[PDB]
C-alpha cells in the first residue's frame, strides 16, 4: 500500500545501474551483438520488474489478490498478441517474396 | 448444406476433390454431437414439459459424474481426430505446395487489376485478360498478385483460393482432371465493379487444343510490350470482356510487383 | 469509496498495456519498412535518448516523494514535489517535441517510410500519454492547493501514481526496443 | 460551414436516400413533438438522460438497439431484394456505389449498435441486481459510456444524410480504405463512429469488471454468483483486453488517412496485412463479447422455466473462463487464405476447434437442466429450445470452417455469411430477445404479451432456416460475399427462397412491435406485483416490479448458490427488517451528455476536415472533464423515510396477494 523512502532510493539507485549499463554497452561497444542484445533485454526486464516491485507497489495482498492476477493475465495477452503477430507476419512476409 | 451438382460438392480438380472428401468427413464427425444435441433439445422439451405426470421430476439434481465425464469427452474424442485430420490436410492442401505429377506445370501469373483479371503466360509470351487455358491432367502454377486493392483469385470448381495483394507474390497450384469451361471469380471485395471480375478457365481436352488456343491468342493487333501499355490496361473499368494480347515483355509480372517495392 | 477507483484505474492501465502492446507489434513488423529512407542507426542520437530517460526516471522518484508527503499529510511538500515532477516531465516532452521537430523539418517525417510512421506513432503515443499526465498533474495541483488533501484528492494522487509510474515502465520497453535494439 | 462540407455532399438526385433522410428528419421531429406536447422534457432530463442508474441505462441501451434493429434490417431487406433482381436479368435499384454502403453500414450497425448495446444493455440492467449491489462501481462512467455509444450513432445515422458511408465492408481493409482508393469521407464516418464508441465501450467493460469483483453482496463468493454474472464477468475481460486492439487498429488508419503515413498502404514500407491481422486480433474476441452474455441469458432461462437447478454449475464456469482465454489464440482463422504457411494455418486451425469443446459442454449442460424438470413453455423458454437448435448447426458449420483445408473453398462466400448469421441470429439475437422478455417484468413492472411473443418466435426461427439455409447451398455453388450486379442466373432459385425468408423475419419484427405495443397498452391486466413473476432463482427477483433507484433497501446476505430460491425455499423471503439506514446514492450528472455532445462535434469536424471546429470540440471534451473534477457534490443520502415508504408499499403488495 505505502512505500517508504527506502523503497525508493533503492529502486532509483538500482534503476540507474540498469539505464546506464545497456546505454553504455550498446553505445561504446563491448561484446558481440549476440551478448549485447541479451544484456539490453535481460536488464530491460529486471528494471521493469524492480519498477513493478518498488514504484507501482505490487504485492499479492492488494484487492483481495486481483492486483497481481490482472497484471499476470495482461502479460499473457501481450505475449500472445505480440509473439503471435510477429510469428504470423514473419510467415506472411516470407511466403510473399519473389520465390 | 446442400448441392449435389454444385461446385464444391462436385469438383473437377484434384485440389478440389480432396477438399470435398474433407468437408464430408467433418460433416459426419460432427453429426455425432449435433444430431443428439438437436434430438435431445426436442425429446427433453417434450417428455418433461409441464403436464407429463409420467416422468421423474428431480429439481435437486446438478452434480453427476457419469453424465459429466462422458459429455466432456465425446467433444474431446471428436476434436482430437478432427485435429490430426486438420493437420494432415493442411500440410497437403497448402497452396504453396507443388502438385505431384509427371508433367511440367504451366506457370500463369495473375495480376488482379481494377475490376478485371490479367493472366500472363511468361513461357508462351501471351497475356490474356479475364480468361485462362491449360491442358487437362496437367498442373498449373498461379503466381497471383495485384495492381490495386486486395483481391482473391478463386476457381470454385477446381479447388482452393488465394489472396492477391499489391506488392506480393502468392502462389497457387491447381489441376483440372476433366476438360470443360470452369467459372472463376474474385473471392474478396474489391470496390465499385467487383461484381464483374468473372473469368472462364477453359480446360482443354489435350495439349494440341491448348497450343491452338495460344495460337489464336498470339494473333492479335494488341501488344503488351511496355509498362506504358500496362498502365493503359489499368484505367478503372468494369465488366472487361475477354481480350487476347500478344508478345509480352519478359519479367513483366516481376515489374508489377517491383513498383510497390521501390 | 476510494480504493475501488484505484483498482478500476489499474484495470484501465492493463487495457493501456495492451494498447501499447499493439503499437510494439506494429513497430516490430514495420521497423524494416525503411524504403530508400533512414534506417534505425542513422537518426537515433543515443546520448539524446539517455538524457530523456534520466528526465523520466527522475520524474518517478520526484512523484514518489509526493506520495510519501501525502502519506505524511504535508500538503506544501506535496505541491513542492509535484511541481518538480511537472518540471521533469515537461523537459521530457520538450526533448520529445524537439526530436520530432528535427525529424520533420529534415524530410524524415512520418510520411517518409513505414518505419518512421511506426516510430512516430509508438514514441508519439507515449508522448501523448506523458502530456496527458502533465495536464492531469497540473489540474491536480490546482485542487491540492485550493482544497487541500481531502478524501477525493488523495485518490487522484494515487490514481496518478499508477499512471505516472507506468509511463516510465513503458519507457523501459521503449528505449530498449526502439532506440537500444535499433541503434545496436 | 467550412471544410469539405457543402451541398454537393447531401444526396439530392438519388431517390432512395432522399426519402429516408426525409423520413428520419420527419420521425425524429415527430418524436420531439410528442415529447413536448405531453411536457415530458424535464422528466426526460432529470430522470432518464442525465441518469447514473444501471436500471435506467440498461433500458436506454436497449431502446437504441431496438430502434436501430429497424435501421439495420432495412439494409438487409434491400440487399436481399437486389440479389433477387440482379440474379434474373434486371439490373436492380442499387448501383454498386449505393449497395457497397449498405452491406458496410449493416455490419457496422448490427454489430456495434444493435448487438453490442443489447448485450451491454442486459449486463447493465441485471448484473448490479444479481450480485446484490445498489449500482455499478462507477456510476458517472456508465452514463458517459452510454452517451459515447450514442455519439457513434449520431455519426452513422447521419452518414447516409450528409456524405456517404464506407464502401469497404464492416471491417474496412487497408488498401481499399486508404486515402488513395476511398478518398471521399466514407471511411472517416466508419473511423470516428467506431473510435468514439470504442472509447465509450472500453470504459463500460471496466465498470462491470470492477462491479462484479468488488461490489458483490456480503457472502457471494466467485463460485456462488449467477451464471449470467459469471458470463458477464468473462465478457468484460474480453472488452478490456480486445477493444484496445481496436482503438489502435483504427487510430493507425486515421494517421494513414490524415497525415499520409504509410502504416497500411502497399508502398514505402507499409504492410496491408498488419491491419488484417490486428483488426481480427480484436475481431474474434469481439464475437465472444456477444455470445458469452447470451450464454448467461440462456443459463438462467433454462434453470428457471424448467424448475430445476442448473446442471453442472462448476462446469459451465470453467467453460466460460476457458473461452475467455481460448479466444485470443484463434484470430487467424479469418484469413486462412491470406497465404500463411502450413504450420501457422494448421496451428490456428486447431486452437479454433479446441474452443468448440467448452461451447459444446455449455450447450449440453442446458440440455440436462431440462432433463428431469417441469419445462414451462413461456416464450422466453421457447427461444432457449430454439437457440440450441439454431446454434448447434451454426457451431457445426463454423468448426467446418475452422479446418483450413475446407476454409479455402468456403472463404468469403455465401457459406461464410450464413454461419455468423446462424450463430448471431440463432445466438445473440435469440438471447437478446429471450432476455428482453424474461427481465421485462423487472424493468418496467408488467409482463410482455404472450400470444404475440410466441408469434414472434415462429417467424424468427422459421424465417431464418428459410432465409439462410439457401445461403448454405450457395456457398457450395460458388457465390461470393458482397455481390450486387449481374449475378449468375444459376444462383436465382436459391436467392428467391432466401428472399422469401427475410419477409418472414420482417413479419417477426412486426410481431415484436405489436407485442410491445399490446403489452404497454394492456399493462393494468398483465401486471406483476410480487416482483417474482416467473419463480426465479437469482437475487434480481427479490425486489419489487420495478426495483427502486436503490436496488435493495438492505444488502442481501447470500448463503448459497441460488441466492433467492434458497431464501424462498426455507421461508426467509419477503421478510421485513427492523431499522433501515439512509443509502448513499450517486447524483444524476448532466456532464456526461455534454462530454458526448462535445464529441460529436469533434467527430463531425475531423470527418469533414473542419479543423477550427475539431479543436473546439476536443477542447470541450477536456474542459467539461476538467470542470467535472471540481464538482464536489456527486452523492446524496437517501433518507430512511422514503426507504420505509417504498418497502412498506412493496410488502403490502406482497402480503395482499399471498
Ligand atoms: C456470435 C458470433 C460468432 C460466433 C459465436 C461464432 C462462432 C464460431 N465461428 Fe464464426 N462465429 C461468430 C461470428 C463470426 N464468425 C465469422 C467467421 C468465422 C470464420 C472465418 C472463416 C473464413 O475464413 O472465412 C471461422 C473459421 C469461424 C469459425 C467459428 C467457430 C469455430 C465458432 C465456434 O464458436 C462455434 C462452436 C460451436 C459449436 C461447435 C457448438 C455446436 C456443437 C456442439 C453440440 C458441441 C459438440 C462438440 C463439437 C461439435 C466440437 N467463424 C465472422 C466473420 C465476420 C465477417 O467476415 O463476415 C463472424 C462475425
Ligand atoms: C439508403 O437506403 C436505406 C433505407 O431506405 C428505405 C432505409 O430505410 C434504411 C433504414 C432507415 C430507416 C428509417 C428504416 C427504419 C424503419 C423501418 C420501418 C425499417 C423497416 C422495417 C421492416 C421492413 C420490418 C417492419 C418493422 C416495423 C416497425 C413496421 C412498422 C409498423 C407498422 C404497423 C408498419 C405497417 C405495415 C403494414 C404492411 C401493415 C399496415 C396496414 C394497415 C395499418 C392497414 C390500414 C392502413 C392504413 C393506412 C391505416 C437504411 C439503413 C438504408 O440504407
Ligand atoms: C489523443 C486523445 C486522448 C484523449 C484524452 C487524453 C488527452 C488529455 C487527457 C485527459 C486530460 C488530462 C487529465 C484529465 C483532466 C483532469 C482529470 C482528473 O481530474 O483526474 C482526477 C481523476 C480521479 O478520478 P475522479 O476524481 O474520481 O474523477 C471524477 C471526475 N473525473 O482521474 C481519473 O480517474 C480520470 C483521468 C484519467 C486520465 C486518462 C488519461 C489517458 C491518456 C490517453 C492519451 C491518448 C493517447 C492516444 C491513444 C491512441 C493510439 C494511437
Ligand atoms: C484514441 C481515441 C481518440 C479519441 C479522442 C479522445 C477521446 C477523449 C474524449 C472523451 C473524454 C474521456 C472520457 C471522459 C471521462 C473519463 C472517465 C472518468 O471520468 O473517470 C471517472 C471514474 C470515476 O467516476 P465514478 O466513480 O464513476 O463517479 C463519478 C465521480 N466523478 O474514474 C475511474 O474510476 C477510473 C476508471 C477509468 C479511468 C479513466 C477511463 C479512461 C481514461 C480516459 C479515456 C481516454 C480515451 C483514450 C483511449 C481510449 C481507451 C480508454
Ligand atoms: C435480420 C436478419 C438479417 C438479414 C436478412 C441479414 C442479411 C444480411 C445480408 C444479405 C448480408 C450481406 C450478404 C452479402 O454480403 O452478400 C449481411 C451481412 C452482414 N450481416 Fe446480416 N442480416 C441479418 C441479421 C444480422 C444480424 C442480427 C447481425 C449481427 C447482429 C448481422 C451482421 C451482419 C454482418 C456483420 C454482415 C457483414 C456485412 C459485410 O459484409 O460488410 N446481420 N446480412
Ligand atoms: Cu472468428
Ligand 4 atom nearest to C5, measured from its CA: 34
Q: Which residues is B135 bridged to in the sheet? A: B204
Alpha helices in chain B (DSSP H): 14-29, 35-47, 74-90, 207-217, 227-230, 252-257
CA dihedral D620, D621, D622, D625 (to 10 degrees): 110
**What burial letters (b/e) apply to C41-53, b meaning 16+ CB within 10 Å?**
eebbebeebbebb
A31: how many CB neighbours lie within 10 A of its CB? 12
Helices vs strands, H then E, count in chain D: 32, 2
D28: how many CB neighbours lie within 10 A of its CB? 10
B104: how many CB neighbours lie within 10 A of its CB? 10
Domain spans of chain B, in order of start: 14-92, 106-259
Ligand 1 atom nearest to D411, measured from its CA: 24
Technique employed here was cryo-EM
Q: Which chains form contacts with chain D, at 3 or more CB pairs under 8 Å?
A: A, B, C
Choose among B154, B32, B27, B33: nearest CA to B95: B154
B96: how many CB neighbours lie within 10 A of its CB? 15
C151: how many CB neighbours lie within 10 A of its CB? 8
- Confirm if D167 and D160 have CB atoms less than 8 A apart: no
- The residue of chain A with its CA nearest to that of C62 is A8
How far lies B3's CA from each of D418, D474, D491, in Å?
16, 8, 12
Helix (H, G, I), strand (E, B) or coil at D542: coil
Q: What is the 3-state secondary structure (H, E, C) of D183-204?
A: CCCCHHHHHHHHHCCHHHHHHH
Q: What domain count does chain A have?
A: 2
Closest CB from C4, C32, C117 relative to D210: C4
Q: What is the DSSP secondary-structure string of C116-172?
A: HHHHHTTHHHHHHHHHHHHHHHHHHHHHHHHT-S-TTHHHHHHHHHHHHHHHHHHHH
> Checking phi first, is residue B245 left (phi over 0); if not, alpha (psi -120 to 50) or beta?
beta
Inter-axis angle of helices D274-283 and D285-305, to 10 degrees? 10
* Phi, psi of D52, rounded to the nearest 5 degrees: -105, 85
Q: What is the DSSP secondary-structure string of D79-91?
A: HHHHHHHTTSS--
Distance CA D413, CA B8 (A): 12
Distance CA D56, CA D62 (A): 10
Cell 432433463 belongs to residue:
D371
- Confirm if B147 and D266 have CB atoms less than 8 A apart: no
Q: Which three cell numbers stand for residue A22?
A: 545497456
DSSP B182: E
CA pseudo-torsion sign D287, D289, D292, D298: negative
Choose among A55, A58, A71: nearest CA to A15: A55
Distance CA B82, CA D400 (A): 10
Distance CA D626, CA C136 (A): 9
Choose among B113, B243, B242: nearest CA to B186: B113
C83: exposed, middle or buried (Cβ count in 10 Å: 0-12, 13-18, 19+): middle
How far lies D147's CA from each of D49, D114, D244, D393, in Å?
9, 15, 19, 37
Q: Active site includes D286?
A: yes
Distance CA D54, CA D540 (A): 13
D627: exposed, middle or buried (Cβ count in 10 Å: 0-12, 13-18, 19+): exposed
Distance CA C171, CA D36 (A): 55
Closest CB from D213, D214, D269 relative to C35: D269
- Confirm if B75 and D357 have CB atoms less than 8 A apart: yes
- Let me know the angle formed at the C-alpha of C15 by C13 and C19, rounded to the nearest 5 degrees: 110
Distance CA D367, CA D388 (A): 9
Cell 478457365 belongs to residue:
B201
B88: how many CB neighbours lie within 10 A of its CB? 13
Spatial neighbors of B161 by CB under 8 A, at least 6 apart, are B152, B153, B154, B155, B172, B187, D337, D408, D409, D411
Reduced DSSP (H G I as helix, E B as strand, rest coil) percent helix, strand, coil of chain B, to 5: 30, 20, 50
* Ligand 3 centroid distance, CA of C132 (Å): 7
- Confirm if D350 and B86 have CB atoms less than 8 A apart: yes
- Confirm if C161 and C85 have CB atoms less than 8 A apart: no
Choose among C138, C183, C163, C182: nearest CA to C20: C163
- Do A50 and A3 have their domain in common? yes
CA pseudo-torsion sign D133, D240, D260, D192: negative
- Pick the catalytic residue: D53, D100, D135, D540? D135
Closest CB from D237, D281, D339 relative to A81: D281
Choose among D204, D205, D136: nearest CA to D586: D136
Distance CA D148, CA D113 (A): 11
Which strands, in side-by-side order, build the sheet including B116-120?
A: B170-174, B140-146, B106-113, B116-120, B127-129, B243-244
B137: how many CB neighbours lie within 10 A of its CB? 16
- Find residues 294-333 of chain D whose CB sits inside 8 Å of chain A: 325, 328-329, 331-332
Closest CB from C18, C114, C120 relative to D241: C18
- The residue of chain B with its CA nearest to that of D491 is B6
Element (H, E) at D453: helix D450-453
Element (H, E) at D590: none
- Confirm if D342 and D296 have CB atoms less than 8 A apart: no
Tell me which long-range contacts C142-145 makes (C-beta under 8 A, separation of at least 24).
Answer: C143/D629, C143/D630, C144/C75, C144/C78, C144/C79, C144/C82, C145/C75, C145/C79
Distance CA D109, CA D152 (A): 10
Strand B161-164 vs strand B200-204: parallel, antiparallel, or unpaired? unpaired
Residue nearest to atom 4 of ligand 5 (CA): D76
- Confirm if B112 and B75 have CB atoms less than 8 A apart: no
- Do A13 and A39 have their domain in common? yes
Choose among A26, A56, A57: nearest CA to A41: A26
Distance CA B149, CA B112 (A): 9
Which residues does chain C have within 8 Å of residue B262's beta carbon, measured at their own beta carbons?
Answer: 35-36
Residue D387 CA, chain-centre distance (Å), reads 17
Spatial neighbors of A17 by CB under 8 A, at least 6 apart, are none
Cell 447521419 belongs to residue:
D158
Distance CA B100, CA B175 (A): 10
Looking at the CA of D617, name the nearest ligand: 4
Contact yes or no for A80 and D329 at CB 8 A: yes
- Confirm if D339 and D345 have CB atoms less than 8 A apart: no
Indicate the residue among A23, A42, A57 that finishes a domain: A57
Distance CA B241, CA D409 (A): 25
- Let me know the angle formed at the C-alpha of D535 by D531 and D541, rounded to the nearest 5 degrees: 35
- Confirm if A54 and A9 have CB atoms less than 8 A apart: no
Q: Give break positions in chain D: residue before each, C–N beyond 2.5 Å.
A: none
Query: Which residues constitute the domain of residue C101?
Result: 1-184
Which residues does chain D have within 8 Å of residue B198's beta carbon, measured at their own beta carbons?
Answer: 488
> Max alpha carbon distance in chain B (Å)?
87
Distance CA B161, CA B172 (A): 8
Distance CA C5, CA B262 (A): 51
Ligand 3 atom nearest to C143, measured from its CA: 19
Q: Which of D244, D341, D345 to mutate to test the interface with A (most CBs of A within 10 A)?
A: D341
D6: exposed, middle or buried (Cβ count in 10 Å: 0-12, 13-18, 19+): exposed
Residues of C with CB under 8 A from a CB of A: 3, 7, 10-11, 14, 17-18, 21-22, 24-25, 28-29, 46-47, 49-50, 53-54, 57, 60-61, 64-65, 67-68, 71, 161-162, 165-166, 168-169, 172-173, 175-177, 180-181, 183-184
- Confirm if B218 and B247 have CB atoms less than 8 A apart: yes
Task: Using only the alpha carbons of chain D, give its radius of gyration.
Answer: 25
- Confirm if D437 and D429 have CB atoms less than 8 A apart: no
Q: Which residues is B117 bridged to in the sheet? A: B112
- Confirm if D261 and C117 have CB atoms less than 8 A apart: yes
Which residues does chain B have within 8 Å of residue A96's beta carbon, measured at their own beta carbons?
Answer: 165, 168-170
- Confirm if D410 and D351 have CB atoms less than 8 A apart: no
Looking at the CA of D421, name the nearest ligand: 5
Distance CA D20, CA D16 (A): 7
- Confirm if C30 and D269 have CB atoms less than 8 A apart: yes
Closest CB from D325, D339, D344 relative to A96: D339
D655: exposed, middle or buried (Cβ count in 10 Å: 0-12, 13-18, 19+): exposed
CA dihedral D457, D458, D462, D468 (to 10 degrees): -20
Where do the domains of chain D lie, and which CATH numbers do they carry? 52-552 (1.20.210.10)
Cβ < 5 A residues, ion ligand 6: D 284
* Ligand 4 centroid distance, CA of D247 (Å): 14
Residues lining ligand 1, CB < 6 A?
Answer: B 30, 33-34, 37, 75, 78-79; D 287, 290-291, 333-334, 336, 352, 356, 359-360, 363, 392, 395-396, 398-399, 401-402, 407, 411-412, 416, 419-420, 423-424, 427-428
Q: Which three cell numbers stand for residue C7?
A: 483498482
Distance CA B215, CA B121 (A): 13
Q: What domain count does chain C have?
A: 1
- Do A47 and A66 have their domain in common? no
C182: exposed, middle or buried (Cβ count in 10 Å: 0-12, 13-18, 19+): buried
Residue nearest to atom 43 of ligand 5 (CA): D76
Contact yes or no for D268 and C19 at CB 8 A: no
Q: Which residues is B243 bridged to in the sheet? A: B129
Query: Which residues constitute the domain of residue A77?
Result: 61-99
A39: how many CB neighbours lie within 10 A of its CB? 16
Distance CA B157, CA C17 (A): 47
* Phi, psi of D383, rounded to the nearest 5 degrees: -65, -40
Strand B106-113 vs strand B116-120: parallel, antiparallel, or unpaired? antiparallel
Element (H, E) at D275: helix D274-283
Cell 455453388 belongs to residue:
D477
Distance CA A76, CA C121 (A): 24
Spatial neighbors of D247 by CB under 8 A, at least 6 apart, are C19, D195, D198, D199, D202
Amino acid at each position: 500500500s505505502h512505500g517508504s523512502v527506502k523503497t525508493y532510493m533503492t529502486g532509483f539507485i538500482l534503476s540507474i545501474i540498469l539505464t546506464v549499463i545497456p546505454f553504455w554497452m550498446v553505445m561504446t561497444g563491448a561484446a558481440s551483438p549476440a551478448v549485447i542484445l541479451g544484456t539490453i533485454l535481460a536488464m530491460a526486464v529486471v528494471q521493469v520488474l524492480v519498477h513493478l516491485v518498488c514504484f507501482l507497489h505490487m504485492n499479492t495482498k492488494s484487492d483481495e489478490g486481483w492486483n497481481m492476477t490482472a497484471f499476470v493475465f495482461t502479460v499473457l495477452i501481450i505475449a500472445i498478441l505480440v509473439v503471435g503477430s510477429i510469428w504470423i507476419m514473419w510467415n506472411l512476409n516470407y511466403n510473399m517474396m519473389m520465390h | 448444406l446442400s448441392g449435389c451438382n454444385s461446385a464444391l460438392l462436385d469438383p473437377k480438380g484434384q485440389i478440389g476433390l480432396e477438399q470435398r472428401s474433407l468437408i464430408l468427413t467433418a460433416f459426419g464427425l460432427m453429426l455425432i454431437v449435433v444430431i443428439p444435441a438437436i434430438l435431445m433439445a426436442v425429446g427433453f422439451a417434450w417428455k418433461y414439459r409441464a403436464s407429463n405426470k409420467d416422468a421423474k421430476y428431480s429439481p435437486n439434481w446438478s452434480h453427476s459424474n457419469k453424465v459429466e465425464a462422458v459429455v466432456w469427452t465425446v467433444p474431446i474424442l471428436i476434436i482430437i481426430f478432427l485435429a490430426v485430420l486438420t493437420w494432415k490436410t493442411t500440410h497437403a492442401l497448402e497452396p504453396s505446395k507443388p502438385l505431384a505429377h509427371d508433367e511440367k506445370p504451366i506457370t500463369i501469373e495473375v495480376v488482379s487489376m481494377d475490376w478485371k483479371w490479367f493472366f500472363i503466360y511468361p513461357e508462351q509470351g501471351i497475356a490474356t485478360v479475364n480468361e485462362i487455358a491449360f491442358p487437362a491432367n496437367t498442373p498449373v502454377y498461379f503466381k497471383v498478385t495485384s495492381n490495386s486493392v486486395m483481391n482473391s483469385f478463386f476457381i470454385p470448381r477446381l479447388g482452393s483460393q488465394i489472396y492477391a495483394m499489391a506488392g506480393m507474390q502468392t502462389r497457387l497450384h491447381l489441376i483440372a482432371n476433366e476438360p470443360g469451361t470452369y467459372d472463376g471469380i474474385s473471392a474478396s471485395y474489391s470496390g465499385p465493379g467487383f461484381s464483374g471480375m468473372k473469368f472462364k478457365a477453359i480446360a482443354t481436352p489435350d495439349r494440341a487444343a491448348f497450343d491452338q488456343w495460344v495460337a489464336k491468342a498470339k494473333q492479335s493487333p494488341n501488344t503488351m510490350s511496355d509498362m506504358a501499355a500496362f498502365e493503359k490496361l489499368a484505367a478503372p473499368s468494369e465488366y472487361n470482356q475477354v481480350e487476347y494480347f500478344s508478345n509480352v515483355k519478359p519479367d513483366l509480372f516481376a515489374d508489377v510487383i517491383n513498383k510497390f517495392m521501390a | 469509496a476510494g480504493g475501488t477507483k484505484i483498482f478500476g484505474f489499474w484495470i484501465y492501465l492493463m487495457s493501456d498495456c495492451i494498447l501499447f502492446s499493439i503499437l510494439f507489434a506494429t513497430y516490430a513488423v514495420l521497423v524494416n519498412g525503411t524504403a530508400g529512407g533512414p534506417t534505425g542507426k542513422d537518426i537515433f542520437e543515443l546520448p539524446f535518448v539517455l538524457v530523456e530517460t534520466f528526465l523520466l526516471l527522475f520524474s518517478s522518484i520526484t512523484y514518489g516523494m509526493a506520495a510519501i508527503a501525502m502519506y505524511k499529510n504535508n500538503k506544501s511538500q506535496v505541491i513542492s514535489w509535484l511541481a518538480l515532477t511537472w518540471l521533469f516531465g515537461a523537459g521530457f516532452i520538450g526533448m520529445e517535441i524537439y526530436e520530432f521537430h528535427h525529424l520533420i523539418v529534415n524530410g524524415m517525417g512520418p510520411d517518409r517510410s513505414g518505419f518512421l510512421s511506426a516510430f512516430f506513432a509508438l514514441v508519439g503515443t507515449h508522448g501523448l500519454h506523458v502530456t496527458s499526465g502533465l495536464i492531469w498533474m497540473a489540474v491536480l495541483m490546482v485542487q491540492i492547493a485550493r482544497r487541500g488533501l481531502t478524501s477525493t484528492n488523495r485518490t487522484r494522487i494515487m490514481c496518478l501514481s499508477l499512471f505516472w509510474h507506468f509511463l516510465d515502465v513503458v519507457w523501459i520497453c521503449v528505449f530498449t526496443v526502439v532506440y537500444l535494439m535499433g541503434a545496436m | 460551414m467550412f471544410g469539405k462540407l457543402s451541398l454537393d455532399a447531401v444526396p439530392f438526385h438519388e431517390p432512395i436516400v432522399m426519402v429516408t433522410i426525409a423520413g428520419i428528419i420527419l420521425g425524429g421531429l415527430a418524436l420531439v413533438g410528442l415529447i413536448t406536447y405531453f411536457g415530458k422534457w424535464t422528466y426526460l432530463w432529470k430522470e432518464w438522460l442525465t441518469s447514473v442508474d444501471h436500471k435506467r441505462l440498461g433500458i436506454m441501451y436497449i431502446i437504441v438497439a431496438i430502434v436501430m434493429l429497424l435501421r439495420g434490417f432495412a439494409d438487409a431487406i434491400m440487399m436481399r431484394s437486389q440479389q433477387a433482381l440482379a440474379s434474373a436479368g434486371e439490373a436492380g435499384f442499387l448501383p454498386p456505389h449505393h449497395y457497397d454502403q449498405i452491406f458496410t453500414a449493416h455490419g457496422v450497425i448490427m454489430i456495434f449498435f444493435v448487438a453490442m448495446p443489447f448485450v451491454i444493455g442486459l449486463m447493465n440492467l441485471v448484473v448490479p441486481l444479481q450480485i446484490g449491489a445498489r449500482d455499478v462501481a462507477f456510476p458517472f462512467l456508465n452514463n458517459l459510456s452510454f452517451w459515447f455509444t450514442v455519439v457513434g450513432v449520431i455519426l452513422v445515422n447521419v452518414s447516409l444524410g450528409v456524405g456517404e458511408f464506407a464502401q469497404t465492408g464492416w471491417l474496412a481493409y487497408p488498401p481499399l480504405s486508404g486515402i488513395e482508393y476511398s478518398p471521399g469521407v466514407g471511411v472517416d464516418y466508419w473511423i470516428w463512429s467506431l473510435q468514439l464508441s470504442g472509447i465509450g465501450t472500453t470504459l463500460t467493460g471496466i465498470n462491470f469488471f470492477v462491479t462484479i469483483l468488488k461490489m458483490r453482496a456480503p457472502g457471494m463468493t466467485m463460485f456462488k454468483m449467477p451464471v449470467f454474472t459469471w458470463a458477464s464477468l468473462c465478457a468484460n475481460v474480453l472488452i478490456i483486453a480486445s477493444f484496445p486492439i481496436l482503438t489502435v487498429t483504427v487510430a493507425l488508419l486515421t494517421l494513414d488517412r490524415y497525415l499520409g503515413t504509410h502504416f497500411f498502404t502497399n508502398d514505402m514500407g507499409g504492410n496491408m496485412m498488419m491491419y488484417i491481422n490486428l483488426i481480427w486480433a480484436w475481431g474474434h474476441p469481439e464475437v465472444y463479447i456477444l455470445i458469452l452474455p447470451v450464454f448467461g441469458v440462456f443459463s438462467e432461462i433454462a434453470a428457471t422455466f424448467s424448475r430445476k437447478r442448473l446442471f453442472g454449475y462448476t462446469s459451465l464456469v470453467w467453460a466460460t473462463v476457458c473461452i475467455t482465454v481460448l479466444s485470443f489464440i484463434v484470430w487467424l482463422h479469418h484469413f486462412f487464405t491470406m497465404g500463411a504457411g502450413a504450420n501457422v494455418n494448421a496451428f490456428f486451425g486447431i486452437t479454433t476447434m479446441i474452443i468448440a469443446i467448452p461451447t459444446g459442454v455449455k450447450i449440453f449442460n442446458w440440455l440436462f437442466t431440462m432433463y428431469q424438470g417441469r419445462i414451462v413453455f413461456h416464450s422466453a423458454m421457447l427461444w432457449t429450445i430454439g437457440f440450441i437448435v439454431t446454434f448447434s448447426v451454426g457451431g457445426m458449420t463454423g468448426v467446418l470452417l475452422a479446418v483450413p483445408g475446407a476454409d479455402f473453398v468456403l472463404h468469403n462466400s455465401l457459406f461464410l455469411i450464413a454461419h455468423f448469421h446462424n450463430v448471431i441470429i440463432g445466438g445473440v439475437v435469440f438471447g437478446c430477445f429471450a432476455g428482453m422478455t424474461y427481465w421485462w417484468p423487472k424493468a418496467f413492472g408488467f409482463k410482455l404479451n404472450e400470444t404475440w411473443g410466441k408469434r414472434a418466435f415462429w417467424f424468427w426461427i422459421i424465417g431464418f432456416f428459410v432465409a439462410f439455409m439457401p445461403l448454405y447451398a450457395l456457398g457450395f455453388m460458388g457465390m461470393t460475399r458482397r455481390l450486387s450486379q449481374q449475378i449468375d442466373p444459376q444462383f436465382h432459385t436459391m436467392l428467391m427462397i432466401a428472399a422469401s425468408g427475410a419477409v418472414l423475419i420482417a413479419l417477426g419484427i412486426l410481431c415484436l412491435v405489436i407485442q410491445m405495443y399490446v403489452s404497454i397498452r394492456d399493462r393494468d391486466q398483465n401486471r406483476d406485483l410480487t416482483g417474482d413473476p416467473w419463480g426465479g432463482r437469482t437475487l434480481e427477483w427479490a425486489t419489487s416490479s420495478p426495483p427502486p433507484f436503490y436496488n435493495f433497501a438492505v444488502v442481501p446476505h447470500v448463503h448459497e448458490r441460488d441466492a433467492f430460491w434458497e431464501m424462498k425455499e426455507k421461508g426467509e423471503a419477503y421478510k421485513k427488517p427492523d431499522h433501515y439506514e439512509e443509502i448513499h446514492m450517486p447524483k444524476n450528472s448532466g456532464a456526461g451528455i455534454v462530454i458526448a455532445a462535445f464529441s460529436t462535434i469533434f467527430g463531425f469536424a475531423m470527418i469533414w476536415h473542419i479543423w477550427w471546429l475539431a479543436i473546439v470540440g476536443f477542447a470541450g471534451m477536456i474542459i467539461t472533464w476538467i470542470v467535472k473534477s471540481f464538482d464536489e457534490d456527486v452523492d446524496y443520502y437517501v433518507p430512511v423515510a422514503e426507504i420505509e415508504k417504498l418497502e412498506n408499499q412493496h410488502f403490502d403488495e406482497i402480503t395482499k396477494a399471498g
